[PDB]
Design an enzyme around this catalytic site. Structure first.
Site, mmCIF file in Angstrom:
data_model
loop_
_atom_site.group_PDB
_atom_site.id
_atom_site.type_symbol
_atom_site.label_atom_id
_atom_site.label_comp_id
_atom_site.label_asym_id
_atom_site.label_seq_id
_atom_site.Cartn_x
_atom_site.Cartn_y
_atom_site.Cartn_z
ATOM 1 N N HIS A 109 38.176 52.033 42.639
ATOM 2 C CA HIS A 109 37.690 51.678 44.086
ATOM 3 C C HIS A 109 37.998 52.830 45.164
ATOM 4 O O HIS A 109 37.117 52.942 46.104
ATOM 5 C CB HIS A 109 38.636 50.293 44.448
ATOM 6 C CG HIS A 109 37.781 49.049 44.026
ATOM 7 N ND1 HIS A 109 37.438 48.668 42.792
ATOM 8 C CD2 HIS A 109 37.093 48.225 44.954
ATOM 9 C CE1 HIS A 109 36.648 47.408 43.115
ATOM 10 N NE2 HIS A 109 36.385 47.207 44.143
ATOM 11 N N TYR A 119 30.217 40.648 39.091
ATOM 12 C CA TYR A 119 31.031 40.998 37.837
ATOM 13 C C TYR A 119 30.271 41.124 36.545
ATOM 14 O O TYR A 119 30.395 41.980 35.662
ATOM 15 C CB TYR A 119 32.317 39.849 37.636
ATOM 16 C CG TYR A 119 33.084 39.983 38.780
ATOM 17 C CD1 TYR A 119 34.205 40.710 38.863
ATOM 18 C CD2 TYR A 119 32.973 39.058 39.994
ATOM 19 C CE1 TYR A 119 35.021 40.731 39.924
ATOM 20 C CE2 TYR A 119 33.811 38.984 41.088
ATOM 21 C CZ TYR A 119 34.897 39.899 41.022
ATOM 22 O OH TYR A 119 35.670 39.898 42.118
ATOM 23 N N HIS A 142 41.423 50.541 37.967
ATOM 24 C CA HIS A 142 40.266 49.932 38.735
ATOM 25 C C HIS A 142 40.462 50.115 40.069
ATOM 26 O O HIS A 142 39.678 50.523 40.697
ATOM 27 C CB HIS A 142 40.191 48.380 38.135
ATOM 28 C CG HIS A 142 39.248 47.610 38.735
ATOM 29 N ND1 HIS A 142 39.208 46.424 38.727
ATOM 30 C CD2 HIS A 142 37.991 48.143 39.222
ATOM 31 C CE1 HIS A 142 37.876 45.858 39.514
ATOM 32 N NE2 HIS A 142 37.379 46.902 39.830
ATOM 33 N N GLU A 143 41.449 49.745 40.654
ATOM 34 C CA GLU A 143 41.812 50.052 42.116
ATOM 35 C C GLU A 143 41.707 51.628 42.432
ATOM 36 O O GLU A 143 41.079 51.949 43.643
ATOM 37 C CB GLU A 143 43.211 49.612 42.477
ATOM 38 C CG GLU A 143 43.612 48.063 42.424
ATOM 39 C CD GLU A 143 42.653 47.245 42.883
ATOM 40 O OE1 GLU A 143 41.429 47.018 42.869
ATOM 41 O OE2 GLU A 143 43.375 46.446 43.824
ATOM 42 N N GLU A 179 32.687 47.860 41.355
ATOM 43 C CA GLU A 179 33.747 47.266 40.226
ATOM 44 C C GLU A 179 33.533 48.106 39.197
ATOM 45 O O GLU A 179 34.400 48.151 38.294
ATOM 46 C CB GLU A 179 33.398 45.805 39.977
ATOM 47 C CG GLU A 179 33.128 44.998 41.238
ATOM 48 C CD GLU A 179 33.882 44.477 42.252
ATOM 49 O OE1 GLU A 179 35.077 44.330 41.787
ATOM 50 O OE2 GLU A 179 33.735 44.542 43.452
ATOM 51 N N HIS A 229 37.182 31.760 43.649
ATOM 52 C CA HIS A 229 35.888 32.458 44.210
ATOM 53 C C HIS A 229 34.844 31.361 44.743
ATOM 54 O O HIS A 229 34.011 31.782 45.702
ATOM 55 C CB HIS A 229 35.258 33.335 43.125
ATOM 56 C CG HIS A 229 35.815 34.436 42.618
ATOM 57 N ND1 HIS A 229 35.532 35.838 43.237
ATOM 58 C CD2 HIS A 229 36.893 34.544 41.920
ATOM 59 C CE1 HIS A 229 36.574 36.678 42.615
ATOM 60 N NE2 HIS A 229 37.469 35.949 41.847
ATOM 61 N N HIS A 287 47.303 39.370 44.833
ATOM 62 C CA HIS A 287 45.529 39.653 44.624
ATOM 63 C C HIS A 287 45.592 41.087 44.022
ATOM 64 O O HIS A 287 46.416 41.890 44.062
ATOM 65 C CB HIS A 287 45.026 39.841 46.063
ATOM 66 C CG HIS A 287 45.207 38.299 46.719
ATOM 67 N ND1 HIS A 287 45.196 37.224 45.757
ATOM 68 C CD2 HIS A 287 45.125 37.978 48.157
ATOM 69 C CE1 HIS A 287 45.651 36.385 46.721
ATOM 70 N NE2 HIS A 287 45.394 36.629 48.156
ATOM 71 N N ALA A 288 44.227 41.614 43.874
ATOM 72 C CA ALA A 288 44.032 42.764 43.378
ATOM 73 C C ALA A 288 42.922 43.518 44.016
ATOM 74 O O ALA A 288 41.952 43.936 43.367
ATOM 75 C CB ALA A 288 43.607 42.778 41.832
#
Ligand SMILES: *[C@@H]1O[C@H](CO)[C@@H](O[C@@H]2O[C@H](CO)[C@@H](O[C@@H]3O[C@H](CO)[C@@H](O)[C@H](O)[C@@H]3O)[C@H](O)[C@H]2NC(C)=O)[C@H](O)[C@H]1NC(C)=O
Ligand SMILES: *[C@@H]1O[C@H](CO)[C@@H](O[C@@H]2O[C@H](CO)[C@@H](O)[C@H](O)[C@H]2NC(C)=O)[C@H](O)[C@H]1NC(C)=O
Ligand SMILES: *[C@@H]1O[C@H](CO)[C@@H](O[C@@H]2O[C@H](CO)[C@@H](O)[C@H](O)[C@H]2NC(C)=O)[C@H](O)[C@H]1NC(C)=O
Ligand SMILES: *[C@@H]1O[C@H](CO)[C@@H](O[C@@H]2O[C@H](CO)[C@@H](O)[C@H](O)[C@H]2NC(C)=O)[C@H](O)[C@H]1NC(C)=O
Ligand SMILES: *[C@@H]1O[C@H](CO)[C@@H](O[C@@H]2O[C@H](CO)[C@@H](O)[C@H](O)[C@H]2NC(C)=O)[C@H](O)[C@H]1NC(C)=O
Lengths: 39, 1043, 50
Positions: free
Chosen positions: B843, B979, B839-840, B867, B969, B809-810
């Site tokens: 976050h 998104y 991206h993380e 996001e 999802h 996962h991310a």
């Protein structure tokens, strides 16, 4: 209301249910993507 | 009828509230507009409606009797006691002297009540509602003093623990009061009292509970008191009042029977209350041994005088009002058809209060007052209230202390006691005017001593009103409060600021620890699916579920609309909804089982050839759908995965939809889709999203045409039609959300190789540790918060297998462990790894930025900002300039070929995703709506795929296939429009950051590196968190509050 | 109270509705009309009696 309309066709609805069950007919169109041309 | 009057709630329970001690306590304690209004209206109806005919008949009979007696009226007879031809005129002049004091006090209290109950229920230029202040009849405002303290820093001198600590008896207070009486050569007290009177609550027998009367045995030799005892100062003051009454009873024993009442009917209360005034002062308490020392401070004096003025000034309009109404009724000026009309005219004219509800001639509101049915004249109380300050001033001037009148007790004042006795000796033997002249110095009532007594608090009130700038009183009559939605079932919802704040803090402090424990359990489970951490995860899930249910039920007793705050109102609203705990226990267990079954069935299902060698979804089916250019293999993988996953989750989905819809209905909303859309707090989200999609349609259409041409050129014309949708399995992705894997097929300029160098030379180094260190270095260079060292000392990121059997996962996990935020992801060697790393990192930076906010307000505005933040910096990271810097490519050029190749890659990444992101939730919203039924789950999904994305099924998809179930999802209840919102928002954020950082020219070549202003504006808009709605953060970041 | 008449709009102390009447600014007693209205019928009854 549709009660009067449904009661008008009640004998035919019962007969159709019986005949479809006897013939193994499945109500609806499960293969909705079907088309007579079939490419 | 007055005595046995009761009011009770519409539920018709076995008990009904009575006036004492239920309704009085409710009106003196409960700060709820609905409950106060219910009590007031119910009591007034119950005690007034059945009393009107009886009072009309009594008025007729009494007028007949007293007209036969000789007086013209009963009211004239009542006025005859005071022996004054112009009694009403002197009373009117007296009140016109005292009007400004009450006007200032009324304005001050109205301002405080406006700050408390808001502006909907209270008008700053109208009258106060007649129930929000103090008593039920608004005669005394003492119970309002809690919220209207002038200086709340000091502690109020209202203490009962000091009495108990010194070991005070329940009857020794009477003895010390008697010695205080005897100090001024008074109290010739008989020995019969202590051996013939009781002063204590009933120990045995069902006698009277409590009252404030002193019945005398008379007989010219013995007297008595029947009164309870407590340890409060109010009880001490009432004791002094009652013993003043007894002293009055003593001093006219020698007089005949009819000459027993003392002069004016108000003289009794005046004599009883002057001593109470002289007793409750703090300095008397200090010198009697009840206080350590005097607080000779201005603020304490103001507090004490405002507490005293809340009962001795707020009562002045009353009494006058009551007996004016009764005189009018007796005179015939008020017929039975004008009782309520004249009553409320007098109430608004003098007191300045309006009825909370609409009244009319059916009601008899004057009958809810005790003294109207139990026929006792009420002007005696007004006369006594005016007179007691005159007596206090006379004694003080005769006590030799010409200072402030507050701390002016008559203790150890021989001459004052002599004057008091001399006045007390003659009861009704002589006209009261001569007695008043003999004591004070003038034969008429005077309001000057009352003004002098309250002079400092009067000056303070005028100054504070001038500073606050408010009208004195009721320039806007005819105003009545709106109904609070008083259809009587929502009266028990607490709407108190203090209780809401306390609940909010308790919820914050318990939620922090419980959510930290849950996050730790989740991290332990996901980092190592072995060692049976699922049991700990289940335990933490149960803890979270029960805690959420308990605190949500606790917060459902509160309200939202009536809360006079922003943060507290937001927290209460966000806690009032239970995401899944609103269902009953059986349905909740079924929902949990269904969700777990769907997730496990998706994460386990694999498809493969009958050869025996088998492949999973990731990274086997995805790899064979990314690097394979062949119709047969791609079609096999696509059909097999759709078959397995979708046909597995089809048997579960309809029940899941039913349960989630039921939960959303129980939560207040009408649908699960509505509940998910409420995360954005925009009532018209769908229209805005449709407008955005219509705006972005032409670019997607052009890209679709170009990619279709490229696919036709490669695959041929048998599989691709130049006019018509492209099959969904030919775009290098399992779900065709991003077309990045077919870039080598759709290269615009093959002779511009400035992007293949990155992954070509990443083998020279670029460890995950050092690339994340570079990422946070760039974050800090922007002007943001540095990452704590625990991310490297404690956290890990390189988990290809790591002894676990869960697909990669991310996601990013957060917990309030002081300072700790950690992530998990599968690390590869390519540029997409750096993009997802940034991206993380975004976050985690978002996690850091709102650290000081409450736990419930830890969200990043709407869940599209969360996001967007990482992708905003990922956009600037992936530019060829930022790749040339930090050595991510050999060389870069601004020529058209390299720029067009870079733009095409970015397009295949983001534009190709726009339709898919909007499509997923669009279908799910229609499914939750009941618009799509189980018979055409697939048909409408593929209709949407053709309409928005422009793709066609590679093979005929029948009913019973459930293609949407193959998306991760959908069998996970994860919203997907976030998104779409993030992909729209991130480009606006990038443009605004570039504009703040300059970089005039093309936007796709701007770099946010070394942009202190951009970083500070991003921080100042990110620190809001979920405290404020997302349009505000949009305005701060961009300049316009719109997407 | 006397006429059974309510204002059509919301009024408050900024207004002075008694001044819209002619006789209030141009100060002239108004009870003479009430007295005359009663007295004319008293006179009519007495005269028709005689
Ligand atoms: C109103 O009537 C009452 C009741 O009669 C009067 O009280 C009584 O007054 C008489 C004298 O007038 C008292 O008698 C005397 O008492 C003592 C006893 O030690 C003593 O001085 C004499 O030997 C004589 O007995 C009497 O006790 C007293 N009480 C009763 C119950 O009779 C009162 O005086 C009258 N008031 C007026 C203003 O006239
Ligand atoms: C009042 O409290 C006192 C506490 O002892 C009780 O008895 C008193 O004791 C003192 C000290 O020996 C004596 O001087 C007093 O005469 C006592 N009586 C008093 C103060 O009234 C007394 O019984 C208590 N009285 C009650 C509870 O009614
Ligand atoms: C409490 O303080 C006030 C002032 O705040 C004292 O008022 C005094 O009043 C007398 C009256 O004759 C003046 O002469 C004094 O100058 C005042 N004292 C000042 C201004 O400090 C009052 O006496 C004090 N009371 C107690 C019990 O301490
Ligand atoms: C009403 O709102 C105010 C303004 O936000 C609240 O004051 C803050 O409350 C938060 C709650 O998390 C605290 O973290 C802040 O420290 C408070 N600010 C301070 C103390 O300056 C207030 O608590 C709310 N409630 C009441 C009853 O006023
Ligand atoms: C007195 O009545 C007026 C008329 O309704 C109230 O309304 C305002 O009157 C002012 C002038 O006094 C106008 O400029 C406003 O347009 C009126 N309306 C509003 C909504 O403000 C006025 O508020 C009343 N005066 C007081 C002091 O309450």
């Amino acid at each position: 209301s549709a009660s009067a309309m449904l009661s008008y066709f009640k004998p035919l609805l019962d007969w159709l249910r019986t005949e479809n069950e006897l013939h193994g007919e499945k109500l609806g169109w499960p293969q909705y993507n079907w088309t007579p041309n079939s490419a | 009828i007055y005595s046995t009057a009761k009011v009770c709630l519409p539920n018709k329970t076995a008990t009904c509230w009575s006036l004492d001690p239920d309704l009085t306590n409710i009106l003196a304690s409960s700060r709820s507009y609905a409950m106060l209004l219910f009590a007031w209206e119910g009591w007034h109806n119950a005690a007034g409606i059945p009393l009107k005919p009886l009072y009309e008949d009594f008025t007729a009979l009494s007028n007949e009797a007293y007209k036969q007696d000789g007086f013209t009226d009963t009211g004239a007879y009542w006025r005859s006691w005071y022996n004054s031809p112009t009694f009403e005129d002197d009373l009117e002049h007296l009140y016109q002297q005292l009007e400004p004091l009450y006007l200032n006090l009324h304005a001050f209290v109205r301002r405080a009540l406006h700050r408390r109950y808001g502006d909907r229920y209270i008008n700053l230029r109208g009258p106060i509602p007649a129930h929000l202040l103090g008593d039920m009849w608004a005669q005394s405002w003492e119970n309002i003093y809690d919220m209207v303290v002038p200086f709340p820093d000091k502690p109020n001198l209202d203490v009962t623990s000091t009495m108990l600590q010194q070991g005070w008896n329940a009857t020794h207070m009477f003895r010390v009061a008697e010695e205080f009486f005897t100090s001024l050569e008074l109290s010739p007290m008989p020995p019969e009292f202590w051996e013939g009177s009781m002063l204590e609550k009933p120990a045995d027998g069902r006698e009277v509970v409590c009252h404030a009367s002193a019945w005398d045995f008379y007989n010219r030799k013995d007297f008595r008191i029947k009164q309870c005892t407590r340890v409060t100062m109010d009880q001490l003051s009432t004791v002094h009042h009652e013993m003043g009454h007894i002293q009055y009873y003593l001093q006219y024993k020698d007089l005949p029977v009819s000459l027993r009442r003392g002069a004016n009917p108000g003289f009794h209360e005046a004599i009883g209350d002057v001593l109470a005034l002289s007793v409750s002062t703090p300095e008397h308490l200090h010198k009697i041994g009840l206080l350590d020392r005097v607080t000779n401070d201005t603020e304490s004096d103001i507090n004490y005088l405002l507490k005293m003025a809340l009962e001795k000034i707020a009562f002045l309009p009353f009494g006058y009002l009551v007996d004016q109404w009764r005189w009018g009724v007796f005179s015939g000026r008020t017929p039975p058809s004008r009782y309520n009309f004249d009553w409320w005219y007098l109430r608004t004219k003098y007191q300045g209060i309006c009825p909370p509800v609409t009244r009319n001639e059916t009601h008899f509101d004057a009958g809810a007052k005790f003294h109207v049915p139990n026929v006792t004249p009420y002007i005696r109380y007004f006369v006594s209230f005016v007179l007691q300050f005159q007596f206090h001033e006379a004694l003080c001037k005769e006590a030799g202390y010409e200072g402030p009148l507050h701390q002016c007790d008559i203790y150890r004042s021989t001459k004052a006691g002599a004057k008091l006795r001399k006045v007390l000796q003659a009861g009704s033997s002589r006209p009261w005017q001569e007695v008043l002249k003999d004591m004070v110095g003038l034969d008429a009532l005077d309001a000057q001593p009352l003004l002098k007594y309250f002079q400092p608090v009067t000056q303070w009130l005028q100054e504070q009103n001038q500073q606050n700038g408010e009208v004195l009183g009721w320039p806007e009559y005819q105003w009545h409060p709106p109904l609070p939605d008083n259809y009587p079932e929502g009266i028990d919802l607490v709407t108190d600021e203090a209780e809401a704040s306390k609940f909010v803090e308790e919820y914050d402090r318990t939620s922090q620890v419980v959510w930290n424990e849950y996050a730790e359990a989740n991290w332990n489970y996901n980092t190592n699916i072995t060692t049976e951490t699922s049991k700990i995860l289940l335990q933490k899930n149960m803890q979270i579920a029960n805690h959420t249910l308990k605190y949500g039920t606790q917060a459902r007793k509160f309200d939202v609309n009536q809360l006079q705050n922003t943060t507290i109102k937001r927290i209460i609203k966000k806690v009032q909804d239970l995401e899944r705990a609103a269902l009953p226990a059986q349905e909740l267990e079924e929902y949990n089982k269904i969700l777990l079954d769907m997730e496990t069935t998706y994460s386990v299902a694999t498809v493969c050839h009958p050869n025996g060698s088998c492949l999973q979804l990731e990274p086997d089916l995805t790899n064979v759908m990314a690097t394979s250019r062949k119709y047969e293999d791609l079609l096999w993988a696509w059909e097999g995965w759709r078959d397995k996953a979708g046909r597995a989750i089809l048997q579960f989905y309809p029940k899941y939809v039913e349960l989630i819809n039921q939960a959303a209905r129980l939560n207040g909303y009408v649908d699960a889709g509505d509940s998910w859309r409420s995360m954005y707090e925009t009532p018209s989200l769908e229209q805005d999203l449709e407008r955005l999609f219509q705006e972005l349609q032409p670019l997607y259409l052009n890209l679709h045409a170009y990619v279709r041409r490229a696919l036709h050129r490669h695959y041929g014309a048998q599989h691709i039609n130049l006019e018509g949708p492209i099959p969904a399995h030919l775009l290098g992705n399992m779900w065709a959300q991003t077309w990045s894997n077919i870039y080598d097929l759709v290269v615009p300029f093959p002779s511009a190789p400035s992007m293949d160098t990155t992954e070509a030379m990443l083998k020279q180094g670029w460890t995950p540790r050092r690339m994340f260190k570079e990422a946070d270095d760039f974050f800090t260079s922007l002007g943001l918060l540095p990452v704590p060292p625990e991310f490297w000392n404690k956290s890990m990121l390189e988990k290809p297998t790591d002894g676990r059997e869960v697909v990669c996962h991310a996601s990013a996990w957060d917990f309030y462990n002081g300072k700790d935020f950690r992530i998990k992801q599968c690390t590869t060697v390519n540029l997409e790894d750096l993009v997802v790393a940034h991206h993380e990192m975004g976050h985690i930076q978002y996690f850091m930025q709102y650290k000081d906010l409450p736990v419930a307000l830890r969200e990043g505005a709407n869940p599209g900002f969360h996001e967007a933040i990482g992708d905003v910096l990922a956009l600037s990271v992936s530019t060829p300039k930022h790749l040339h810097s930090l050595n991510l490519l050999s060389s870069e050029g601004g020529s058209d070929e390299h720029d067009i190749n870079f733009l095409m890659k970015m397009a295949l990444d983001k534009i190709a995703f726009i339709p898919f992101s909007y499509l997923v939730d669009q279908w799910r919203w229609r499914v939750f709506d009941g618009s799509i039924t189980k018979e055409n789950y697939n048909q409408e999904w593929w209709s949407l795929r053709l309409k928005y994305q422009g793709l066609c099924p590679p093979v005929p998809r029948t009913q019973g296939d459930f293609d949407p179930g193959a998306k991760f999802h959908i069998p996970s209840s994860v919203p997907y429009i976030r998104y779409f919102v993030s992909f729209i928002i991130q480009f606006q954020f990038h443009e605004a950051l570039c504009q703040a950082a300059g970089h005039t020219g093309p936007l796709h070549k701007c770099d946010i590196y070394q942009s202190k202003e951009a970083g500070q504006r991003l921080a100042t808009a990110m620190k809001l968190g979920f405290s404020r709605p997302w349009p505000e953060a949009m305005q701060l970041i961009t300049g316009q509050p719109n997407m």
